[PDB]
Enzyme design. Sequence first.
Site, short mmCIF file in Angstrom:
data_model
loop_
_atom_site.label_atom_id
_atom_site.label_comp_id
_atom_site.label_asym_id
_atom_site.label_seq_id
_atom_site.Cartn_x
_atom_site.Cartn_y
_atom_site.Cartn_z
N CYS D 59 0.82 -1.21 0.00
CA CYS D 59 0.00 0.00 0.00
C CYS D 59 0.85 1.26 0.00
CB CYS D 59 -0.90 0.01 1.23
SG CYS D 59 0.08 0.09 2.75
N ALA D 62 3.15 1.82 2.83
CA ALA D 62 4.41 1.08 2.72
C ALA D 62 5.38 1.88 1.86
CB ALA D 62 4.16 -0.29 2.12
N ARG D 93 11.83 -3.82 7.30
CA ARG D 93 12.81 -3.47 6.29
C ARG D 93 14.18 -3.29 6.94
NH1 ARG D 93 13.60 1.46 2.49
NH2 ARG D 93 13.50 0.53 0.39
N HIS D 192 5.75 6.21 -3.16
CA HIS D 192 7.04 6.82 -3.43
C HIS D 192 6.81 8.24 -3.90
CE1 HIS D 192 8.72 2.56 -4.52
NE2 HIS D 192 8.55 2.72 -3.22
S1 CFM Z 1 10.14 -4.10 -3.06
FE1 CFM Z 1 13.19 -1.84 -4.99
S2 CFM Z 1 11.72 -0.38 -5.97
FE2 CFM Z 1 11.56 -0.29 -3.70
S3 CFM Z 1 11.47 -2.37 -0.03
FE3 CFM Z 1 12.37 -3.57 -3.44
S4 CFM Z 1 13.08 -4.03 -5.58
FE4 CFM Z 1 10.79 -2.11 -2.20
S5 CFM Z 1 15.23 -0.80 -4.87
FE5 CFM Z 1 14.01 -0.57 -2.95
S6 CFM Z 1 15.09 -1.08 -1.04
FE6 CFM Z 1 13.28 -2.41 -1.47
S7 CFM Z 1 13.68 -4.62 -1.86
FE7 CFM Z 1 13.54 0.73 -5.10
S8 CFM Z 1 12.90 1.44 -3.03
S9 CFM Z 1 9.51 -0.30 -2.70
MO1 CFM Z 1 11.44 -4.43 -1.14
S1 CLF Z 2 -3.33 -0.80 3.17
FE1 CLF Z 2 -1.54 -0.02 4.35
S2 CLF Z 2 -1.40 -1.51 6.13
FE2 CLF Z 2 -3.54 -1.53 5.35
S3 CLF Z 2 -4.75 -0.08 6.59
FE3 CLF Z 2 -4.12 0.84 4.54
S4 CLF Z 2 -2.24 2.03 5.06
FE4 CLF Z 2 -2.52 0.40 6.67
FE5 CLF Z 2 -3.32 -0.97 9.44
S5 CLF Z 2 -4.56 -1.05 11.34
FE6 CLF Z 2 -4.41 -3.15 10.41
S6 CLF Z 2 -2.80 -3.08 8.73
FE7 CLF Z 2 -4.75 -2.25 7.82
S7 CLF Z 2 -6.32 -3.27 9.17
FE8 CLF Z 2 -5.92 -1.04 9.50
#
Ligand code: CFM
Ligand code: CLF
Lengths: 522, 274, 274, 478
Positions: D59, D62, D93, D192
């Site tokens: 999402c 994230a 991460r 991003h």
């Molecule tokens: S899945 Fe990178 S576009 Fe993003 S956490 Fe991983 S292949 Fe991410 S290289 Fe990066 S440090 Fe990443 S490995 Fe770009 S930051 S959203 Mo999951």
């Molecule tokens: S797609 Fe991402 S992880 Fe989902 S809610 Fe939305 S920003 Fe968060 Fe949060 S507390 Fe739990 S994991 Fe959700 S059901 Fe709500």
Amino acid sequence: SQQVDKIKASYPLFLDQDYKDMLAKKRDGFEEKYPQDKIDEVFQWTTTKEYQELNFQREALTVNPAKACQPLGAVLCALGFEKTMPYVHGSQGCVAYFRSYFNRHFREPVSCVSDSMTEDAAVFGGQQNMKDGLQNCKATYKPDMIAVSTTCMAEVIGDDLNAFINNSKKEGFIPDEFPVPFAHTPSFVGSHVTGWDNMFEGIARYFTLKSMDDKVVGSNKKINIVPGFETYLGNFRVIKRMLSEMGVGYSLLSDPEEVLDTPADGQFRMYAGGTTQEEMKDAPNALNTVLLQPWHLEKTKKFVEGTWKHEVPKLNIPMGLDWTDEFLMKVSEISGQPIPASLTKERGRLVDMMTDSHTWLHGKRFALWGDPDFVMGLVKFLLELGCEPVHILCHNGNKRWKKAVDAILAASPYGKNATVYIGKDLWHLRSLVFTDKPDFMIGNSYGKFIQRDTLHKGKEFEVPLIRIGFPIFDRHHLHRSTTLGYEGAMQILTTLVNSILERLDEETRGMQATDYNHDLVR
Amino acid sequence: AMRQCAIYGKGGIGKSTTTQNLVAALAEMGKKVMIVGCDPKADSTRLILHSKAQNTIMEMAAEAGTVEDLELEDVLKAGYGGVKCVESGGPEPGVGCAGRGVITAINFLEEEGAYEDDLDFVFYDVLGDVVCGGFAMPIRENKAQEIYIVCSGEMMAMYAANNISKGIVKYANSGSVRLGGLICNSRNTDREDELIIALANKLGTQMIHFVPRDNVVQRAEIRRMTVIEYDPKAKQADEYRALARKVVDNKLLVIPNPITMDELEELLMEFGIM
Amino acid sequence: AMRQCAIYGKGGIGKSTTTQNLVAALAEMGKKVMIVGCDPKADSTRLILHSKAQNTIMEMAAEAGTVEDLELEDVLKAGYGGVKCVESGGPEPGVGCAGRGVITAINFLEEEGAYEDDLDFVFYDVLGDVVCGGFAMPIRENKAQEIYIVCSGEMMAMYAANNISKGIVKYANSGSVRLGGLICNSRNTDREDELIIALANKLGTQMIHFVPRDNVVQRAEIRRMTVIEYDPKAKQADEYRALARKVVDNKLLVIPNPITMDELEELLMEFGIM
Amino acid sequence: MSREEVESLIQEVLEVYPEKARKDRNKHLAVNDPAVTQSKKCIISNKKSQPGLMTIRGCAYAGSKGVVWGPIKDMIHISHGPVGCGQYSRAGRRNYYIGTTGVNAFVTMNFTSDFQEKDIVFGGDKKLAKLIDEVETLFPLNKGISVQSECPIGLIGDDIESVSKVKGAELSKTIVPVRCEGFRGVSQSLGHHIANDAVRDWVLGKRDEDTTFASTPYDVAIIGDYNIGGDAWSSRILLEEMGLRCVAQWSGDGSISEIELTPKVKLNLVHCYRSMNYISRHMEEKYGIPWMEYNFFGPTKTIESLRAIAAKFDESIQKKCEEVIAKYKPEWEAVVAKYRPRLEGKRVMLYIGGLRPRHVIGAYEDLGMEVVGTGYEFAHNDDYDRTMKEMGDSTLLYDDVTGYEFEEFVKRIKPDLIGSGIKEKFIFQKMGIPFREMHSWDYSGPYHGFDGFAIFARDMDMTLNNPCWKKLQAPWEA
Ligand code: CFM
Ligand code: CLF
Ligand SMILES: Nc1ncnc2c1ncn2[C@@H]1O[C@H](COP(=O)(O)OP(=O)(O)O)[C@@H](O)[C@H]1O
Ligand SMILES: Nc1ncnc2c1ncn2[C@@H]1O[C@H](COP(=O)(O)OP(=O)(O)O)[C@@H](O)[C@H]1O
Ligand code: SF4
Ligand code: ALF
Ligand code: ALF
Ligand SMILES: [Ca+2]
Ligand SMILES: [Mg+2]
Ligand SMILES: [Mg+2]
């Protein structure tokens, strides 16, 4: 550089001089970090009672919680049923998180789907997502049942799961008879355990509510067992072992022990054995229902007593000597099965282990956290061993539960200096282990940072963590362990005693200095 | 130039309709105006477009996937008097979260310039109920600078007006948005004029204008148009033109000073009988 | 016995007020009734309690922390004619999420029995706008079984009625909730009666009753009471008593059959002129 | 092998999908063909994920908290919304850092407003304010705060912008309001873009009027390197060795200060295109700071980049670049000399975020391995264009691959090694296929640069040729 013959990974690597120097320059050059003095100062500050007080005055900020949102529990609950596919109606982000969260704790695959609701799905209300999502899910992963849970998003916008599902069936997206139990699991209410509760209750309603007419209590001669949010394969297995050991007809509702332990033999089994739908449909016909973890099965309790008419026994989580005795005796009474000499001996052995180790245990003060039932039980066992659970923290705890534990503590001299803390996060606990320092702390992997903090103050201030609970991410396979019954008790006892001895050996490993007490026999 | 205004009031009190006609008078005065509908029902622009616009920001965005893939040309249309009209999309009643729709919509317009033009006025025709932070989007930091609450001498309508005032306070203090005044859309209540004026004073504002209830409004409404367009010589038309001038010349912008429920009752008893 | 009904309609069309008076007539007929306010503004029960209730489910729950710590006694109060009244709490305009409030409130009542009694009728006075799934709570699986849409011969009010009908369809098909009919709260539009009847037929329902616009409603409203209580001999009172009987005797429950916007326009042109 | 056998595979898998889903999925499965530079080659990306097909996407939250904002050390990031997002995301991460966690650095921690029902119904805008104060009191050393919107925040419409601006002005602290609501967008990707915009509007501009920072002709900035397992550091050391001065790393061992300093760099080195290209373009059009992409996965790619980068400067730099290449030559050479024979010709399939799926290809070929297939979760066609020149003709390509798909694909392809995420690992291990986490390096050291290459090499061998693999089938069965 790197020496091909002996490659150094991140750890030994960044300790090389050229690397250290680089970081030093980076820090001094563009980080503008606070002077080492200020850092050291503020740190010593965070360990004082003065800090702790301000820390406890918090009314909004939550730091390092000791819980997770409802849907996580709903999912785990879902995984306990035969060929069932967890389906979380809402944002796909959650599902990815749920899966991984469990992936890391069980070191196993975690199948779960989301109907991926997005911007316009939220604004317009994702009924289509439900329709297509269900159809697609069945067709692709061929599950026998789909357990619908929710995301705060879907909970805010009031997406009528039932209406959606009903319409999904009526509009031909899935067979009308396809089992699609649902449950509303608002992230912002209760916690993961509540999710487990809601999900279960919903499933129980689905295969029961209407068909309650032909049901008769005791007719199936089985005793229903609800594990609740359980993340130790051993905990499911021990209950089933004891029950079979007594020759007690039982039915463990939501049994994912199989799904969470698929054998690696070149084949991937997405689904595994679990509670058959028939067991659920027939559940009302059981003699009674025992809730292994009553404190988070509240809604289920009301449904079982109310609709199933089962007189659910007021039993505590079968943890430690006393409670395990009570559990067995109650089961014995309900099933009419006498406690076999098999179990009687096992109880005796645990007592024997207690007597053999009472010396080192007696007096050791502990700090702990986790789900209500788990904690409550852990406390009782600790008391039975002659230990002192000084800091009992249960973030997702409630007023009544606190009272229960308090009463338990007031029942023993060892609980004298204990203090139950509800709605408190690990940052609060961090202060407790600093101000009123205990010997060790029992908890999930999140506590490793508290130990890091404590040690940073000084070696004598370091409070070692004993990994028992959920989640455990930095230790391989501890999820196989057991905490319930005499078996679980024995394991916990052993773990504790040995943890004590370990730290002692370390403290007394100093040759010439402290090694004089480094005994071969203990 | 460029005055962003937000219209609020008791549900169905006539905000949309009044705004529609009001703007017509502004357009007739050579004032370039744009109206942003903030009601899930794209009904804020019917009288200007002479048709119920279907190209709403949300529905359109959905067609192109992400709102980011949307382009102004596709949702912005000019109608009577060159008045530009845009409609925040919205789910049908009882589903989704209309509030978020408005949030995204306003943000969309903001980013695609839209306001960024030579517009004399921008009117946010918000829905009557305003049940969330989303519907308060037009009253945020740099949006509307002046709000106008529509109401009638009806107890409920007045309560709503006062209740809405309360919500406004939170935003007035955090920004610069101020309540310009109350526009009484007559609903033939006994001492209507006195009532509204009394409330206006109590709040610390004014009763910008008293719009008489005239079925001409409906007759024009039926034919998809504002009274101005339907019958420029109609008495009601002059009334709207008057209101328009009033708004244009209004310099009174205040922070609503709400009253307690008891105070409201007291006001109703003194100014609402005989 | 026990008929759960849900009232919906154009914002400010008079649902609350009509429901208030309607119930009064029911109470006068010896019918035990309860009214669940589903508007963030606890205005669904004023005329019965003769005061604006402050003990709303949400506000009260907040005082006791978790809604789970709340108890019916604290939020349920009986007023005129022994009519029990409850109000879903709600945030002030422009903040929070009123929708969730209703969701939690309805769930609360459901769990604490509430409905579980000897009530002849239960009325969900929902807000006019109904911008989310939350406000459709009363139309869920086992809640209201019959909905009544209030409206007037006003284009906007009619659109709202039709628009609301659309939302209802989603729930009608998934459950058993049906549209009983339309209650025209007269707002003195030209061919009002014809218009509403025309729409009613088009939708596949009926025009349960035509409530005349009478300032007596306001006069009674001012004095915190229903026309029945304020003046039993008032002509309007008999009108409400009539509506009450109509609702009690109503056996017509259908799944709304909505019309396209164009169809609505067409209807307005044919039945709304002359 | 052969696009015909592959196209058959794609078409076979698609068979289980109900017409609607089948139609969509076909557009995200394609057989690579170099030279082709577009979507023409049956490949469309960055679109709504089909409901119910169990995708591996995340999402917007994230995208912001998870990858972009979280990594910042001396800054407190509040997971604004219900508990969960923050918890599940807490220390997931491996964006490594150097700091005293809890006093000046806060990455490891999970700060959340732990939304409860009443906060939704009434809007936790006041809660946020009170929260901030509590933060300032309990964490004096923070150099800024950032609110990461979780779904609820977006829906209820909490004026977090205002809370941030008001509290910020009062406390004289940088408070960044990010609208990364999980539902907004289609994956972490938009997250991003959003995070970047947030940086642009709330952080970058802070030092525009300030000229006190002493710049040099070799001031560079690494953007798009999250120091996963130390990745950024292992890359930085090389750059600086060849005379450059890394003023700032974007979301590595990053501090708010160096981020504010970035507009003074002479050149921006973009590693992760998908996540930072946005801000990179902004810095150019505004501060006139040019930006170029590069790759540090494997010696060939690293060396290629090192030269191309030094080429943007004068001779002292270029000359040094060669000294660096020379220095590390015997090392990476020894690495391949040892490991390549053990991995020679071994086929590999991948699936990662929005960069690595193509970036690591070079490194694989340096050890003699062949990537028979790869795909992204959230990459746009921008990435796919670049991907095609990397993938060998007739290799399989997939966007937002469904769980079922990856399984079936793997079944026929029968790779010797697979590299994907945590949600994949155990699935393929069960199948008996050596798996390696390409997101978290499977808890292993850095992969970037030469030092990282040695580790990457060891890891691949370690797993691919592990004895555990031969023991999958019990002797009493055949
Ligand atoms: S899945 Fe990178 S576009 Fe993003 S956490 Fe991983 S292949 Fe991410 S290289 Fe990066 S440090 Fe990443 S490995 Fe770009 S930051 S959203 Mo999951
Ligand atoms: S797609 Fe991402 S992880 Fe989902 S809610 Fe939305 S920003 Fe968060 Fe949060 S507390 Fe739990 S994991 Fe959700 S059901 Fe709500
Ligand atoms: N002054 C008036 N005279 C007659 N009818 C009016 C007058 N003002 C509004 N109306 C009618 O009231 C009904 C609702 O108006 P509307 O603007 O849609 O309400 P709202 O703004 O609150 O949503 C429509 O018939 C409208 O034309
Ligand atoms: N028949 C009527 N005659 C006169 N005034 C009426 C009539 N019906 C309603 N009203 C007035 O309309 C205003 C709003 O009523 P209300 O019920 O609160 O609207 P809503 O239900 O849609 O929220 C109040 O003054 C109300 O008394
Ligand atoms: S009350 Fe508002 S924020 Fe809440 S679901 Fe409804 S439209 Fe959305
Ligand atoms: F459509 Al409205 F108040 F403008 F109900
Ligand atoms: F208060 Al209403 F429609 F009942 F605006
Ligand atoms: Ca495993
Ligand atoms: Mg409107
Ligand atoms: Mg109302």
